[PDB]
Amino acid sequence: GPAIGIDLGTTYSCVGVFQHGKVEIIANDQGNRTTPSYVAFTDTERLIGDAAKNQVAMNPTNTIFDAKRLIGRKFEDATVQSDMKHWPFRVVSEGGKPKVQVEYKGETKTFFPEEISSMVLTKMKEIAEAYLGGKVHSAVITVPAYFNDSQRQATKDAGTITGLNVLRIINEPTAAAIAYGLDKKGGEKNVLIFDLGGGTFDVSILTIEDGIFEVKSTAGDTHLGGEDFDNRMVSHLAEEFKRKHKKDIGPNKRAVRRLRTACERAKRTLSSSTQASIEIDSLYEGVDFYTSITRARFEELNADLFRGTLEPVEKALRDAKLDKGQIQEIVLVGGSTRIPKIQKLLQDFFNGKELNKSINPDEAVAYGAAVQAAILIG
Ligand SMILES: NC(=O)c1cnccn1
Fold first, then answer.
1. Does residue 252 line the site of ligand 1, with CB under 6 A?
2. Do the beta carbons of residue 48 and residue 119 sit within 8 Å?
3. Which residue(s) pair with 169 in the sheet?
4. What are the phi and psi torsion angles at 319 (to 5°)?
5. What is the span of the domain harbouring residue 261?
6. How far is the CA of 254 from the centre of ligand 1 (A)?
7. Where do runs of H (alpha helix) occur along 180-225?
8. Residue 166 CA neighbour count, 13 Å, CB half
9. Structural contact between residues 62 and 42, judged by C-beta atoms closer than 8 angstroms
């Protein structure tokens, strides 16, 4: 031991340990139970995790995130060429493989995606060592069900560079089903995993029988998540600010970014309260922006995006050749599945069926990976 599971996520990662028969999800040095998959290069140092995400606005060209969208792919791949148009950092080609290019200590450096992901995994490993004491040797690391062998191997390579024994690479939806004990809960079970993250949406249909998992279908949207909901709140409240103070913040990127920060936090509050307060000091020309937003307003601004999540569900069913009534278990994954309106649409779509949601959905994948690590060690 220790028995360690790592969710290596597109924008956030999570590490758990299995100890005394149960999973403990591990908070990092800032007390956060999830850690940004961010790596920043400055004039003097390499920052990882919270420290990297916290200076992203100040240093956007040298702060890497989304390395998971590059790992195991070729520079010429259509997704890479399309994704590159939206990143503030530079992506270059070496022997046909993508690399991020940054300034670090005054010089140009290039890193393979598995090198950036290794720096992330090193941070996750140190987070678990600060929690446990001593050293971590081994981990189960998770990947999307649609990852091919090149993406799986490059993820493993990130673990190898970090100096972890990678016990197994398992699918993220499988790890979530494991967290709920669905392989132990004697028949086949069709399980739908609905995984709605900060910037990705994955629907997976699995069958589970006598502890064997098979992926039947996958669907979703690789560029839809919680950040899209925040953006709807940003446009709404920027218009409100314009209406109340006759000041357009739109051309000012610091004012938009600060509004966005407030909206992200308001949105989190709205999954447990019916209202949230925005309290921005000196948003624009010394003018404060103090206001409040209701859950009903947030749901309205997002009507298309929330209802639209049911369309990959229907596609995954059609591809699996299943009627919705043939799903035995529905599993919520990703921070965005906390939104009550999303849970209601999904539940009504499944004719009132209860959702597996008792595990923090942003932790379920690391939770299942930690159970799997315990099994493999043992
Ligand atoms: N959503 C936005 O980024 C936004 C909206 N209105 C003005 C400026 N930015």
1. no
2. yes
3. 141
4. -65, -40
5. 225-308
6. 11
7. none
8. 22
9. yes
